Design a protein around this ligand. Structure first.
Ligand SMILES: CCn1c(-c2cc(N3CCN(C)CC3)cnc2[C@H](C)OC)c2c3cc(ccc31)-c1csc(n1)C[C@H](NC(=O)[C@H]1C[C@@H]1C)C(=O)N1CCC[C@H](N1)C(=O)OCC(C)(C)C2
Ligand SMILES: Nc1nc2c(ncn2[C@@H]2O[C@H](COP(=O)(O)OP(=O)(O)NP(=O)(O)O)[C@@H](O)[C@H]2O)c(=O)[nH]1
Ligand SMILES: [Mg+2]
Lengths: 168, 164
């Protein structure tokens, strides 16, 4: 029976966590803003020839409830660290998310992928090199995405599965 | 003299009962007047026919998206959004009526009714009314909710208006 991977999508509010996940699951793009409480999804995929079951937790970006992330971080196996390439604050927020995951899991070695979303917009404030340099300093992959065009959507989730496989 | 408004609630179209609200026009007149006008429909749009899209037991019942009917919309009588009028009033317990928002100065038509004290919302959401009659209707709406707020039946404002 196929292996199950517990993926968790985290990042500041409005960066496109839900748009990315719904693109993966439903193959369409939500242009409206429906702020998340918490949602979970399942999808089977084939990655590197091996069929895998993705269990995706789409989390809230509200800073107000930062204290309540610990339980889903304990449970999750791999994390998409999502920022938006036109939102320098959400890029700055990445550090806090990663440090929080490391603390809660008490490990330097947690599967993660840095995701720079909204690559379709012209208003970029975070240079790709900055993001790439940050990913390299974390030792994790960096994927540029657009939930609107689907660019990189599969790649971001599949790369995270690959990171979990290497870890196990 | 603070105005009173009513919602007649239905569940998958069957009547549940009436909730009435006192609106604190004496403390938050602009916010109270928006909710009043939207409850009468007098601008040609308002809450009649719209749903409670988010119900989380232990916390609150949220509704008021009459423009998109998916929890993302709504609009005020002043424009799509209006500013936070004041935060004088606090989320003190069950029955508090308060504006939903997407950050500072983004009030539209969405609102929520507390079913418990939610003090961490103080200073962030404008409180502007309280359940007067029918808190048991709000309590009965809770079982149609869930942890993330998805509802298991369609909870609707079948009718609404101002009481004299
Ligand atoms: C951590 C998980 N979580 C939780 C949470 C918090 C706690 N505690 C916090 C307090 N301590 C002391 C005890 C523990 C426990 N259990 C959970 C839930 C049950 O765990 C699944 C909440 C929440 C809110 C948002 C996102 C995640 C969230 C959120 C996401 S957008 C938002 N808030 C504000 C929301 N804007 C909108 O809709 C905009 C789109 C329209 C125009 C809005 O104006 N209103 C009205 C006020 C209430 C709020 N919605 C709402 O729904 O609050 C849910 C609530 C359960 C009250 C809080
Ligand atoms: N142009 C463009 N817009 C995007 C993209 N991803 C998300 N958006 C838009 O950004 C807004 C917020 O998206 P959403 O997926 O809800 O973000 P979130 O990270 O899930 N927000 P929350 O933390 O509140 O749950 C929506 O208007 C959505 O259409 C993208 O790649 N390109
Ligand atoms: Mg979301």
């Amino acid at each position: 029976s196929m292996t199950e991977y517990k993926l968790v999508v985290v990042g500041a509010d409005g960066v496109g966590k839900s748009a990315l996940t719904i693109q993966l699951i439903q193959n369409h793009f939500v242009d409206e803003y429906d702020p998340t409480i918490e949602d979970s999804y399942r999808k089977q995929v084939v990655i590197d020839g091996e069929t895998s079951l993705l269990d995706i937790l789409d989390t809230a970006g509200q800073e107000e409830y930062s204290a309540m992330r610990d339980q889903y971080m304990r449970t999750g196996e791999g994390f998409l660290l999502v920022f938006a390439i036109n939102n320098t604050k959400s890029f700055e927020d990445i550090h806090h998310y990663r440090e929080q995951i490391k603390r809660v899991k008490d490990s330097e070695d947690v599967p993660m992928v840095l995701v720079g979303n909204k690559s379709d917009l012209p208003s970029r404030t975070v240079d790709t090199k900055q993001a790439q340099d940050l990913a390299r300093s974390y030792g994790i992959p960096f994927i540029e995405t657009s939930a609107k065009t689907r660019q990189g959507v599969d790649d971001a989730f599949y790369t995270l599965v690959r990171e979990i496989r290497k870890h196990k | 003299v603070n105005p009173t408004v009513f919602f007649d609630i239905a569940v998958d179209g069957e009547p549940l009962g009436r909730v009435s609200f006192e609106l604190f026009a004496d403390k938050v007149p602009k916010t109270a007047e928006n909710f009043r006008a939207l409850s009468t429909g007098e601008k040609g749009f308002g809450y009649k026919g719209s749903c409670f899209h988010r119900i989380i037991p232990g916390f609150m019942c949220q509704g008021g998206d009459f423009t998109r009917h998916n929890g993302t919309g709504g609009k005020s009588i002043y424009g799509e959004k209006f500013e936070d009028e004041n935060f004088i009033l606090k989320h003190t317990g069950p029955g508090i009526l308060s504006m939903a928002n997407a950050g500072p100065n983004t009030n539209g038509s969405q609102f929520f009714i507390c079913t418990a004290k939610t003090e961490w919302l103080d200073g962030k959401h404008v409180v502007f009314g309280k359940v007067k009659e029918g808190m048991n209707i709000v309590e009965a709406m809770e079982r149609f909710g869930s942890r993330n707020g998805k509802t298991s039946k369609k909870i609707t404002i079948a009718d609404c208006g101002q009481l004299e």
